[PDB]
């Protein structure tokens, strides 16, 4: 257990040694008593593990062949109703990933005063960029009008409704005056976290996944499908991290978790469910093979219940999952 | 290139929403509030997108690089006290330097680069900083170093602190929650931050260290650390090229900011960085090690400074030769 002479670096600023970080002084928010620039010693092992797991999931949209997708898209084989599902989903996702990425950088990162959690955030934000690249790649491959697709959240009411809601639940976290060192401020911050991790990534995205992966299972648009499988694998970790972060902040700041905040989070999730159901209905006015709006009523309620449970809230809908295969692809894409 | 099929268009039910489609010619690198920043398309800055694609093609993780030979050498008496000093001081500086760079991308740069393709690159770059930070943790754990001792070096070692303090100063007022780039003064301050982090920190302050560590690698010493630094160098080369492109792009779009006064201030900042970096090299090398002496870094740091100056349209000022020409070899 012995190293040779000179294996330590020597300080010439003696008072500087006090800036070594006390592990137990570290906190997820409002931590100004220790140096946030030093990674060590790691306190939140869960955050570090999410980071390592994400790093092991590198993929690039350009590694996935689109030849069969292009051939199918350009043919007359797809019904207009099938195309409608694909186009609306691309429309929503093309900008939703940028909304998530921008929120990580511009809202979340400043207030998560912890280096190991920030490491994960940097991986997460980069993954959003990869997802955005996916939608560009799909548009270019299929010869879609890229501006029509990317502007969809400004042109289609059911998509705009979801993203206007997102803006509302973002709160004032972007404001130069926003701070998390009041009870009210930290509560607002937690609502932003619920909005992005639980609602946008955990409910809005998972519903899109069923629509697209339903095509994949029918051997239609399998290039898009494979890309969405990779996206789902990432989003599984994003969600797990977000849940851990919310639960960690609650534990360290129990005064924020009032009946009032609890009830508001429940109402926000209810509003998300209604908006996602309305979106599914816009995607499926008549339904397509293997996909009807009524199935999404049950599915969206089901997953909302699962999200509520994970952050210590009671399930409210009690519906069953009409897509058992999603759980099996969820199983295959489970975090280590 | 096939025909657009019937029914393959997304139909609008908000009729005036079409106005929000982004006009290519309206996009700008800074102060762009006339178009929607959330939509990537249409891509204007091809150079930014190219840097993004290049970074994505460079994936690596430190845990993929075996440390067995490095551990054996570190435990042996075949590495001198002086060689250990060079390694430890560099690990000390780099362990927090990448966190500083990444934090600045997120907390200072991203908000004000009002362009989605440039932001795609920034997210890739910030993730690469995280990979580099991981690298230094992994080296510490592999070699059984005191991790708190290494990561706290920038608070404990004067020559390291001097570099990072200068870095805090040149960061300017960009972190002020009310800082804005929509004035000549504001944009000049922002450009000074870009020079500070891309040119000075990533383009000069990393370079004595690269030379020192890669010199060990060329002598077959600590080849595990060496390989990790080779991957870091590959990333850092793209970081620098992006930063130079961004600075030059902002200048082109806002030429009124590039005043003789600003040009002179930037030269003076780079001169101060050179002095600090030479002092850091002197701290690493109180005595010579094979092919490395403190005096060599006077020539080298000045040489690379001249190269950085040229790339952002400023005249070289030192005119020194490069004593480490092998740094320009491809691996």
PDB file of C-alpha atoms in Angstrom, chain B residues 125-262:
ATOM      1  CA  UNK B 125     -18.895  21.004 -26.287  1.00  0.00           C
ATOM      2  CA  UNK B 126     -20.312  21.192 -22.735  1.00  0.00           C
ATOM      3  CA  UNK B 127     -20.788  17.419 -22.695  1.00  0.00           C
ATOM      4  CA  UNK B 128     -17.148  17.010 -23.811  1.00  0.00           C
ATOM      5  CA  UNK B 129     -16.090  19.129 -20.812  1.00  0.00           C
ATOM      6  CA  UNK B 130     -17.978  16.645 -18.594  1.00  0.00           C
ATOM      7  CA  UNK B 131     -16.101  13.735 -20.247  1.00  0.00           C
ATOM      8  CA  UNK B 132     -12.791  15.527 -19.556  1.00  0.00           C
ATOM      9  CA  UNK B 133     -13.759  16.074 -15.881  1.00  0.00           C
ATOM     10  CA  UNK B 134     -14.593  12.342 -15.639  1.00  0.00           C
ATOM     11  CA  UNK B 135     -11.133  11.631 -17.091  1.00  0.00           C
ATOM     12  CA  UNK B 136      -9.423  13.366 -14.173  1.00  0.00           C
ATOM     13  CA  UNK B 137     -11.546  11.576 -11.591  1.00  0.00           C
ATOM     14  CA  UNK B 138     -10.725   8.277 -13.348  1.00  0.00           C
ATOM     15  CA  UNK B 139      -6.959   9.033 -13.310  1.00  0.00           C
ATOM     16  CA  UNK B 140      -7.164   9.929  -9.589  1.00  0.00           C
ATOM     17  CA  UNK B 141      -8.976   6.696  -8.721  1.00  0.00           C
ATOM     18  CA  UNK B 142      -6.695   4.551 -10.923  1.00  0.00           C
ATOM     19  CA  UNK B 143      -3.482   5.881  -9.340  1.00  0.00           C
ATOM     20  CA  UNK B 144      -4.851   6.143  -5.798  1.00  0.00           C
ATOM     21  CA  UNK B 145      -4.349   9.915  -5.607  1.00  0.00           C
ATOM     22  CA  UNK B 146      -6.019  12.015  -2.871  1.00  0.00           C
ATOM     23  CA  UNK B 147      -8.915  13.306  -5.004  1.00  0.00           C
ATOM     24  CA  UNK B 148      -9.639  16.328  -2.769  1.00  0.00           C
ATOM     25  CA  UNK B 149      -5.960  17.292  -2.925  1.00  0.00           C
ATOM     26  CA  UNK B 150      -5.973  17.173  -6.751  1.00  0.00           C
ATOM     27  CA  UNK B 151      -9.339  18.877  -7.326  1.00  0.00           C
ATOM     28  CA  UNK B 152      -8.570  21.611  -4.782  1.00  0.00           C
ATOM     29  CA  UNK B 153      -5.215  22.449  -6.430  1.00  0.00           C
ATOM     30  CA  UNK B 154      -6.524  25.709  -7.912  1.00  0.00           C
ATOM     31  CA  UNK B 155      -7.062  26.938  -4.343  1.00  0.00           C
ATOM     32  CA  UNK B 156      -3.758  25.565  -2.987  1.00  0.00           C
ATOM     33  CA  UNK B 157      -1.140  26.291  -5.661  1.00  0.00           C
ATOM     34  CA  UNK B 158      -0.346  29.945  -6.477  1.00  0.00           C
ATOM     35  CA  UNK B 159       0.618  29.481 -10.157  1.00  0.00           C
ATOM     36  CA  UNK B 160      -2.634  27.566 -10.797  1.00  0.00           C
ATOM     37  CA  UNK B 161      -4.777  30.032  -8.816  1.00  0.00           C
ATOM     38  CA  UNK B 162      -3.222  32.981 -10.721  1.00  0.00           C
ATOM     39  CA  UNK B 163      -4.424  31.506 -14.049  1.00  0.00           C
ATOM     40  CA  UNK B 164      -7.942  30.779 -12.804  1.00  0.00           C
ATOM     41  CA  UNK B 165      -8.254  34.164 -11.014  1.00  0.00           C
ATOM     42  CA  UNK B 166      -7.289  35.902 -14.259  1.00  0.00           C
ATOM     43  CA  UNK B 167      -9.962  33.723 -15.857  1.00  0.00           C
ATOM     44  CA  UNK B 168     -12.607  34.923 -13.372  1.00  0.00           C
ATOM     45  CA  UNK B 169     -11.647  38.521 -14.152  1.00  0.00           C
ATOM     46  CA  UNK B 170     -11.871  38.134 -17.935  1.00  0.00           C
ATOM     47  CA  UNK B 171     -15.216  36.322 -17.550  1.00  0.00           C
ATOM     48  CA  UNK B 172     -16.361  39.913 -17.053  1.00  0.00           C
ATOM     49  CA  UNK B 173     -19.881  40.865 -16.027  1.00  0.00           C
ATOM     50  CA  UNK B 174     -21.439  38.176 -18.253  1.00  0.00           C
ATOM     51  CA  UNK B 175     -22.824  36.215 -15.279  1.00  0.00           C
ATOM     52  CA  UNK B 176     -24.757  39.259 -13.982  1.00  0.00           C
ATOM     53  CA  UNK B 177     -28.397  38.134 -14.333  1.00  0.00           C
ATOM     54  CA  UNK B 178     -29.169  41.424 -16.144  1.00  0.00           C
ATOM     55  CA  UNK B 179     -26.166  41.315 -18.489  1.00  0.00           C
ATOM     56  CA  UNK B 180     -27.232  41.838 -22.122  1.00  0.00           C
ATOM     57  CA  UNK B 181     -25.373  41.850 -25.462  1.00  0.00           C
ATOM     58  CA  UNK B 182     -27.705  44.338 -27.199  1.00  0.00           C
ATOM     59  CA  UNK B 183     -25.347  47.326 -27.015  1.00  0.00           C
ATOM     60  CA  UNK B 184     -21.833  47.943 -28.345  1.00  0.00           C
ATOM     61  CA  UNK B 185     -20.438  47.827 -24.788  1.00  0.00           C
ATOM     62  CA  UNK B 186     -22.359  44.635 -23.938  1.00  0.00           C
ATOM     63  CA  UNK B 187     -21.300  42.806 -27.102  1.00  0.00           C
ATOM     64  CA  UNK B 188     -17.662  43.841 -26.618  1.00  0.00           C
ATOM     65  CA  UNK B 189     -17.800  42.403 -23.088  1.00  0.00           C
ATOM     66  CA  UNK B 190     -19.276  39.156 -24.445  1.00  0.00           C
ATOM     67  CA  UNK B 191     -16.542  38.907 -27.078  1.00  0.00           C
ATOM     68  CA  UNK B 192     -13.930  39.370 -24.322  1.00  0.00           C
ATOM     69  CA  UNK B 193     -15.483  36.378 -22.508  1.00  0.00           C
ATOM     70  CA  UNK B 194     -15.251  34.321 -25.724  1.00  0.00           C
ATOM     71  CA  UNK B 195     -11.595  35.269 -26.145  1.00  0.00           C
ATOM     72  CA  UNK B 196     -11.011  34.509 -22.440  1.00  0.00           C
ATOM     73  CA  UNK B 197     -12.410  30.985 -22.610  1.00  0.00           C
ATOM     74  CA  UNK B 198     -11.774  29.829 -26.194  1.00  0.00           C
ATOM     75  CA  UNK B 199      -8.513  31.608 -26.980  1.00  0.00           C
ATOM     76  CA  UNK B 200      -6.895  31.995 -23.576  1.00  0.00           C
ATOM     77  CA  UNK B 201      -8.153  29.106 -21.447  1.00  0.00           C
ATOM     78  CA  UNK B 202      -8.684  26.434 -24.089  1.00  0.00           C
ATOM     79  CA  UNK B 203      -6.171  27.808 -26.617  1.00  0.00           C
ATOM     80  CA  UNK B 204      -3.192  28.769 -24.407  1.00  0.00           C
ATOM     81  CA  UNK B 205      -3.613  27.672 -20.733  1.00  0.00           C
ATOM     82  CA  UNK B 206      -4.054  24.017 -21.753  1.00  0.00           C
ATOM     83  CA  UNK B 207      -0.988  23.937 -23.999  1.00  0.00           C
ATOM     84  CA  UNK B 208       2.074  23.729 -21.737  1.00  0.00           C
ATOM     85  CA  UNK B 209       0.195  20.890 -20.069  1.00  0.00           C
ATOM     86  CA  UNK B 210      -0.495  19.131 -23.358  1.00  0.00           C
ATOM     87  CA  UNK B 211       3.220  19.389 -24.238  1.00  0.00           C
ATOM     88  CA  UNK B 212       4.340  18.135 -20.818  1.00  0.00           C
ATOM     89  CA  UNK B 213       1.983  15.154 -20.637  1.00  0.00           C
ATOM     90  CA  UNK B 214       2.367  14.152 -24.298  1.00  0.00           C
ATOM     91  CA  UNK B 215       6.159  14.287 -23.856  1.00  0.00           C
ATOM     92  CA  UNK B 216       5.828  11.490 -21.258  1.00  0.00           C
ATOM     93  CA  UNK B 217       3.646   9.539 -23.710  1.00  0.00           C
ATOM     94  CA  UNK B 218       6.291   9.838 -26.458  1.00  0.00           C
ATOM     95  CA  UNK B 219       8.866   8.345 -24.034  1.00  0.00           C
ATOM     96  CA  UNK B 220       6.439   5.479 -23.257  1.00  0.00           C
ATOM     97  CA  UNK B 221       5.761   6.791 -19.739  1.00  0.00           C
ATOM     98  CA  UNK B 222       2.196   6.964 -18.342  1.00  0.00           C
ATOM     99  CA  UNK B 223       0.754   6.012 -21.736  1.00  0.00           C
ATOM    100  CA  UNK B 224      -2.761   5.644 -20.236  1.00  0.00           C
ATOM    101  CA  UNK B 225      -2.803   9.295 -19.116  1.00  0.00           C
ATOM    102  CA  UNK B 226      -1.140  10.167 -22.444  1.00  0.00           C
ATOM    103  CA  UNK B 227      -3.849   8.505 -24.527  1.00  0.00           C
ATOM    104  CA  UNK B 228      -6.569  10.279 -22.515  1.00  0.00           C
ATOM    105  CA  UNK B 229      -4.795  13.604 -23.173  1.00  0.00           C
ATOM    106  CA  UNK B 230      -4.651  12.760 -26.909  1.00  0.00           C
ATOM    107  CA  UNK B 231      -8.449  12.379 -26.944  1.00  0.00           C
ATOM    108  CA  UNK B 232      -8.748  15.639 -24.950  1.00  0.00           C
ATOM    109  CA  UNK B 233      -6.457  17.429 -27.424  1.00  0.00           C
ATOM    110  CA  UNK B 234      -8.611  16.227 -30.343  1.00  0.00           C
ATOM    111  CA  UNK B 235     -11.719  17.707 -28.653  1.00  0.00           C
ATOM    112  CA  UNK B 236      -9.913  20.934 -27.686  1.00  0.00           C
ATOM    113  CA  UNK B 237      -8.780  21.528 -31.270  1.00  0.00           C
ATOM    114  CA  UNK B 238     -12.429  21.605 -32.386  1.00  0.00           C
ATOM    115  CA  UNK B 239     -13.440  23.749 -29.352  1.00  0.00           C
ATOM    116  CA  UNK B 240     -10.819  26.317 -30.373  1.00  0.00           C
ATOM    117  CA  UNK B 241     -11.842  26.246 -34.078  1.00  0.00           C
ATOM    118  CA  UNK B 242     -15.498  26.772 -33.137  1.00  0.00           C
ATOM    119  CA  UNK B 243     -14.623  29.653 -30.786  1.00  0.00           C
ATOM    120  CA  UNK B 244     -12.500  31.329 -33.473  1.00  0.00           C
ATOM    121  CA  UNK B 245     -15.345  30.942 -35.998  1.00  0.00           C
ATOM    122  CA  UNK B 246     -17.848  32.342 -33.487  1.00  0.00           C
ATOM    123  CA  UNK B 247     -15.663  35.362 -32.639  1.00  0.00           C
ATOM    124  CA  UNK B 248     -15.025  36.064 -36.344  1.00  0.00           C
ATOM    125  CA  UNK B 249     -18.736  35.589 -37.156  1.00  0.00           C
ATOM    126  CA  UNK B 250     -19.816  38.057 -34.480  1.00  0.00           C
ATOM    127  CA  UNK B 251     -17.214  40.529 -35.783  1.00  0.00           C
ATOM    128  CA  UNK B 252     -18.458  40.169 -39.361  1.00  0.00           C
ATOM    129  CA  UNK B 253     -22.108  40.723 -38.361  1.00  0.00           C
ATOM    130  CA  UNK B 254     -21.281  43.596 -35.974  1.00  0.00           C
ATOM    131  CA  UNK B 255     -18.069  45.170 -37.349  1.00  0.00           C
ATOM    132  CA  UNK B 256     -18.640  48.322 -35.264  1.00  0.00           C
ATOM    133  CA  UNK B 257     -17.634  46.398 -32.113  1.00  0.00           C
ATOM    134  CA  UNK B 258     -14.131  45.608 -33.455  1.00  0.00           C
ATOM    135  CA  UNK B 259     -12.634  49.002 -32.557  1.00  0.00           C
ATOM    136  CA  UNK B 260      -8.900  49.762 -32.271  1.00  0.00           C
ATOM    137  CA  UNK B 261      -9.544  50.072 -28.520  1.00  0.00           C
ATOM    138  CA  UNK B 262     -11.072  46.573 -28.270  1.00  0.00           C
TER     139      UNK B 262
END
